[PDB]
Amino acid sequence: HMASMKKKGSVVIVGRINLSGDTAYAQQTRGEEGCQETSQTGRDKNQVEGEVQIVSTATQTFLATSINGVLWTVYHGAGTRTIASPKGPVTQMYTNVDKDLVGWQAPQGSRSLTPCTCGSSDLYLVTRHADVIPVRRRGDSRGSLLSPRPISYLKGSSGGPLLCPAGHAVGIFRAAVSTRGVAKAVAFIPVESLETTM
Ligand SMILES: COc1ccc2nc(C)c(O[C@@H]3C[C@H]4C(=O)N[C@]5(C(=O)NS(=O)(=O)C6(C)CC6)C[C@H]5/C=C\CCCCC[C@H](NC(=O)O[C@@H]5C[C@@H]6C[C@@H]6C5)C(=O)N4C3)nc2c1
Numbered sequence: 001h002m003a004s005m006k007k008k009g010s011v012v013i014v015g016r017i018n019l020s021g022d023t024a025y026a027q028q029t030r031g032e033e034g035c036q037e038t039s040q041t042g043r044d045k046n047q048v049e050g051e052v053q054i055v056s057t058a059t060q061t062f063l064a065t066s067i068n069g070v071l072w073t074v075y076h077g078a079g080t081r082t083i084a085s086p087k088g089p090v091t092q093m094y095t096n097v098d099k100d101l102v103g104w105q106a107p108q109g110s111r112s113l114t115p116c117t118c119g120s121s122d123l124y125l126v127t128r129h130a131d132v133i134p135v136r137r138r139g140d141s142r143g144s145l146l147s148p149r150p151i152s153y154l155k156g157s158s159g160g161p162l163l164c165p166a167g168h169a170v171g172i173f174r175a176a177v178s179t180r181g182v183a184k185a186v187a188f189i190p191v192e193s194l195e196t197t198m
């Protein structure tokens with residue numbers, strides 16, 4: 001009934017992938033209980049830091065990556081949801097279901113990656129466990145893992161970055177090509193597609 005219809009909660013930042021020093025490591029900044037409460041109100045007062053955020057809904061958890069002042073993630077994780085912020089829910093400024101892409105304004109305190117113009121095919125994928133996986137670019141939006149591993153290790157890392165040797169953002173992790181449960185290649189949203197969407 002109309003009086004009963006509920007509203008989906010906001011995406012909530014629950015942690016980050018720390019790439020500050022020489023050792024990548026995941027940090028949690030908000031627990032389950034706090035995440036639930038923040039998703040309902042859309043009011044997140046936590047300080048935000050870094051380029052790669054760990055984000056959650058009531059049912060999913062994935063990554064979001066800041067590039068050129070926009071926090072990017074995948075549509076199949078975020079849908080059309082708002083993101084929580086200190087002043088309330090923030091509406092998406094980019095939504096493209098054909099690209100599996102959404103974006104909000106980068107939160108205050110975050111840092112943005114620079115789009116890559118190197119043209120290099122030696123990439124690095126950052127997972128939600130702070131694993132840095134070498135990936136060879138095989139096309140406009142595909143890349144192969146130098147060391148294949150079960151898809152279990154990539155699950156929950158959509159929205160994470162593929163980086164060039166210089167640490168520029170080359171793309172956003174979107175999907176995994178699996179053979180008998182082994183991820184041999186990944187699909188990503190090229191940064192050029194982000195720059196065109198912008
Ligand atoms: C609804 O509107 C839209 C619009 C566009 C759209 N576009 C997609 C390509 C898509 O695909 C979905 C989600 C994605 C995924 O799970 N992505 C992760 C990830 O981690 N998600 S997540 O855990 O964070 C989660 C679910 C958010 C919380 C990185 C993977 C990690 C492990 C894979 C797990 C088994 C799955 C293997 C699968 N493979 C594959 O589809 O391969 C194909 C497409 C291209 C390579 C070829 C053939 C795969 O990867 N999928 C399945 N849904 C949509 C939906």
Ligand SMILES: [Zn+2]
Binds near residue numbers: 117119166
């Ligand atoms: Zn580069």
